[PDB]
Design a protein around this motif. Structure first.
Motif, PDB file in Angstrom:
ATOM      1  N   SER A   1      33.736  39.255  23.757  1.00  0.00           N
ATOM      2  CA  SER A   1      33.883  40.697  24.103  1.00  0.00           C
ATOM      3  C   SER A   1      32.851  41.171  25.121  1.00  0.00           C
ATOM      4  O   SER A   1      33.122  42.054  25.922  1.00  0.00           O
ATOM      5  N   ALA A   2      31.672  40.568  25.094  1.00  0.00           N
ATOM      6  CA  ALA A   2      30.625  40.836  26.088  1.00  0.00           C
ATOM      7  C   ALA A   2      31.056  40.616  27.546  1.00  0.00           C
ATOM      8  O   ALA A   2      30.437  41.166  28.438  1.00  0.00           O
ATOM      9  N   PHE A   3      32.121  39.845  27.788  1.00  0.00           N
ATOM     10  CA  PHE A   3      32.749  39.799  29.124  1.00  0.00           C
ATOM     11  C   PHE A   3      33.428  41.111  29.540  1.00  0.00           C
ATOM     12  O   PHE A   3      33.797  41.277  30.691  1.00  0.00           O
ATOM     13  N   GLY A   4      33.620  42.012  28.578  1.00  0.00           N
ATOM     14  CA  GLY A   4      34.143  43.358  28.865  1.00  0.00           C
ATOM     15  C   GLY A   4      35.642  43.429  28.657  1.00  0.00           C
ATOM     16  O   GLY A   4      36.305  42.396  28.551  1.00  0.00           O
ATOM     17  N   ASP A   5      36.166  44.661  28.628  1.00  0.00           N
ATOM     18  CA  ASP A   5      37.566  44.917  28.296  1.00  0.00           C
ATOM     19  C   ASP A   5      38.492  44.456  29.416  1.00  0.00           C
ATOM     20  O   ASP A   5      38.156  44.523  30.599  1.00  0.00           O
ATOM     21  N   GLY A   6      39.639  43.921  29.017  1.00  0.00           N
ATOM     22  CA  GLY A   6      40.632  43.425  29.955  1.00  0.00           C
ATOM     23  C   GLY A   6      40.437  41.987  30.403  1.00  0.00           C
ATOM     24  O   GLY A   6      41.243  41.484  31.171  1.00  0.00           O
ATOM     25  N   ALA A   7      39.382  41.308  29.943  1.00  0.00           N
ATOM     26  CA  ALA A   7      39.138  39.919  30.373  1.00  0.00           C
ATOM     27  C   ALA A   7      40.026  38.934  29.631  1.00  0.00           C
ATOM     28  O   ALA A   7      40.157  39.050  28.443  1.00  0.00           O
TER      29      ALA A   7
ATOM     30  N   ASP B   1      42.848  27.658  30.111  1.00  0.00           N
ATOM     31  CA  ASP B   1      42.317  26.356  30.540  1.00  0.00           C
ATOM     32  C   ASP B   1      43.002  25.884  31.792  1.00  0.00           C
ATOM     33  O   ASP B   1      44.221  26.020  31.923  1.00  0.00           O
ATOM     34  N   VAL B   2      42.252  25.378  32.756  1.00  0.00           N
ATOM     35  CA  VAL B   2      42.815  24.857  33.999  1.00  0.00           C
ATOM     36  C   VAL B   2      42.879  23.319  33.938  1.00  0.00           C
ATOM     37  O   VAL B   2      41.877  22.622  33.674  1.00  0.00           O
TER      38      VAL B   2
ATOM     39  N   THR C   1      38.287  28.725  31.610  1.00  0.00           N
ATOM     40  CA  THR C   1      38.033  29.736  32.636  1.00  0.00           C
ATOM     41  C   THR C   1      38.161  31.137  32.034  1.00  0.00           C
ATOM     42  O   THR C   1      39.078  31.383  31.206  1.00  0.00           O
ATOM     43  N   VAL C   2      37.257  32.052  32.438  1.00  0.00           N
ATOM     44  CA  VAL C   2      37.296  33.449  32.008  1.00  0.00           C
ATOM     45  C   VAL C   2      37.570  34.286  33.244  1.00  0.00           C
ATOM     46  O   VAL C   2      36.875  34.147  34.254  1.00  0.00           O
ATOM     47  N   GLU C   3      38.602  35.138  33.173  1.00  0.00           N
ATOM     48  CA  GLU C   3      39.040  35.931  34.328  1.00  0.00           C
ATOM     49  C   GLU C   3      39.062  37.441  34.051  1.00  0.00           C
ATOM     50  O   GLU C   3      39.233  37.907  32.904  1.00  0.00           O
ATOM     51  N   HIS C   4      38.797  38.207  35.098  1.00  0.00           N
ATOM     52  CA  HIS C   4      38.996  39.649  35.016  1.00  0.00           C
ATOM     53  C   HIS C   4      39.352  40.209  36.363  1.00  0.00           C
ATOM     54  O   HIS C   4      38.771  39.846  37.408  1.00  0.00           O
ATOM     55  N   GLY C   5      40.362  41.075  36.327  1.00  0.00           N
ATOM     56  CA  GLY C   5      40.664  41.932  37.434  1.00  0.00           C
ATOM     57  C   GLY C   5      41.421  41.286  38.557  1.00  0.00           C
ATOM     58  O   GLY C   5      42.097  40.251  38.410  1.00  0.00           O
ATOM     59  N   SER C   6      41.256  41.911  39.711  1.00  0.00           N
ATOM     60  CA  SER C   6      42.129  41.750  40.823  1.00  0.00           C
ATOM     61  C   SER C   6      41.333  41.814  42.106  1.00  0.00           C
ATOM     62  O   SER C   6      40.314  42.506  42.169  1.00  0.00           O
TER      63      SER C   6
ATOM     64  N   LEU D   1      30.145  43.829  36.744  1.00  0.00           N
ATOM     65  CA  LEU D   1      30.766  43.719  38.051  1.00  0.00           C
ATOM     66  C   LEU D   1      32.293  43.956  38.056  1.00  0.00           C
ATOM     67  O   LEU D   1      32.961  43.658  39.067  1.00  0.00           O
ATOM     68  N   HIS D   2      32.845  44.468  36.946  1.00  0.00           N
ATOM     69  CA  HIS D   2      34.280  44.781  36.891  1.00  0.00           C
ATOM     70  C   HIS D   2      34.652  45.595  38.141  1.00  0.00           C
ATOM     71  O   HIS D   2      33.872  46.447  38.576  1.00  0.00           O
ATOM     72  N   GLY D   3      35.788  45.244  38.741  1.00  0.00           N
ATOM     73  CA  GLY D   3      36.364  46.017  39.821  1.00  0.00           C
ATOM     74  C   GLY D   3      35.996  45.549  41.210  1.00  0.00           C
ATOM     75  O   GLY D   3      36.665  45.953  42.165  1.00  0.00           O
ATOM     76  N   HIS D   4      34.947  44.718  41.364  1.00  0.00           N
ATOM     77  CA  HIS D   4      34.619  44.170  42.713  1.00  0.00           C
ATOM     78  C   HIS D   4      35.575  43.119  43.218  1.00  0.00           C
ATOM     79  O   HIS D   4      35.487  42.709  44.379  1.00  0.00           O
ATOM     80  N   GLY D   5      36.470  42.640  42.369  1.00  0.00           N
ATOM     81  CA  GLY D   5      37.381  41.572  42.778  1.00  0.00           C
ATOM     82  C   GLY D   5      37.847  40.825  41.542  1.00  0.00           C
ATOM     83  O   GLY D   5      37.631  41.298  40.427  1.00  0.00           O
ATOM     84  N   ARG D   6      38.482  39.676  41.773  1.00  0.00           N
ATOM     85  CA  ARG D   6      38.983  38.786  40.762  1.00  0.00           C
ATOM     86  C   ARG D   6      37.774  37.948  40.290  1.00  0.00           C
ATOM     87  O   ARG D   6      37.332  37.076  41.027  1.00  0.00           O
ATOM     88  N   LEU D   7      37.256  38.300  39.121  1.00  0.00           N
ATOM     89  CA  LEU D   7      36.033  37.662  38.571  1.00  0.00           C
ATOM     90  C   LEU D   7      36.449  36.419  37.825  1.00  0.00           C
ATOM     91  O   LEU D   7      37.309  36.494  36.954  1.00  0.00           O
TER      92      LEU D   7
END
Length: 291
Positions: free
Chosen positions: A3-9, A13-14, A23-28, A52-58
């Protein structure tokens, strides 16, 4: 994901060569790829990732050998590890990439960049495996331990059988002591002697006083790209630091092209746990400046 990765994450597995890279991903947006080093995982980045949410595809990865990724019975040479990294970047066919790199994450992300210059937008790094290190410049306790770990047998006993890298050495080298619960998360990937194999490869691969020469040669491969690319680069520095010795900092200033360098306050090595507010803030200002 945690949860510490923040909401919406999300996490997935790749596939790579039979194995799985967690892999952990967030956003766009344009991608921002976080690579850890030894003996951590994507978890180390959580607080910076969230801010850093919102700066890009994390995109935060657990390298093969670590976290929730596969732990195969291979030799963890730098060239072997680099193949799995190269594979992960291929699966996601990323372009316009901002790399955010620490420890062997710098070694692997800079080597990738150097061979994929047209895919790289920017790179930020701190406490990197970058260059040969002079033993006089490193904590003497770490230097003595590394020397013992490079001995056949003794390294495997300390790291794999006794688990002293994770129970003693790792928590020692925090400026602000690691919370018990966090120390526990860093240890969950490593329940067995075999699961710990990559942890020992780290100190053995670290270039200290010119050895191993294979590592000096490996790291030398990115030097032309560092010195000649116009790609914007950002080095964060800490007091006292650990891997970023004065000599290496002086080399970076004299050799690396388009490098901004910013003090980020008090820290030793795992600076993502020590100064995550300052780091996210300095990263944020820099990404905005780039944009």
């Amino acid at each position: 994901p945690h949860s510490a990765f923040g909401d919406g994450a999300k996490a997935y597995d790749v596939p790579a060569f039979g194995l799985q890279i967690h892999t952990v991903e967030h956003g766009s947006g344009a991608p921002i790829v976080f690579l850890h080093g030894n003996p951590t995982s994507s978890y180390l980045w959580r607080h910076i990732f969230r801010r850093l949410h919102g700066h890009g595809r994390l995109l935060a990865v657990d390298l093969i050998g670590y976290g929730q990724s596969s732990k195969p019975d291979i030799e963890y040479t730098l060239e072997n590890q680099q193949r799995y990294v190269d594979a992960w970047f291929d699966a996601l066919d990323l372009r316009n990439v901002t790399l955010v790199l620490q420890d062997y994450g710098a070694a692997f992300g800079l080597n990738w960049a150097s061979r994929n210059p047209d895919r790289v937008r920017a790179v930020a790094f701190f406490e990197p495996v970058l260059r040969n290190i002079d033993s006089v410049d490193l904590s003497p306790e770490f230097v003595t331990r590394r020397a013992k770990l490079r001995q056949p047998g003794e390294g495997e006993i300390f790291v794999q059988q006794e688990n002293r890298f994770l129970t003693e050495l790792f928590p020692w080298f925090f400026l602000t002591p690691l919370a018990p619960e966090d120390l526990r998360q860093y240890q969950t990937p490593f329940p067995t002697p075999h699961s710990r194999k990559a942890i020992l490869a780290g100190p053995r691969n670290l270039p200290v006083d010119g050895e191993p020469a294979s590592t000096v040669a490996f790291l030398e491969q990115a030097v032309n790209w560092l010195n000649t690319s116009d790609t914007p680069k950002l080095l964060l520095t800490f007091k006292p630091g650990f891997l970023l010795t004065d000599a290496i900092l002086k080399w970076s200033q004299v050799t690396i092209r388009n490098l901004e360098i910013e003090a980020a306050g008090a820290g030793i090595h795992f600076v993502q746990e020590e100064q995550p507010e300052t780091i996210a803030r300095l990263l944020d200002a820099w990404l905005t400046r780039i944009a």
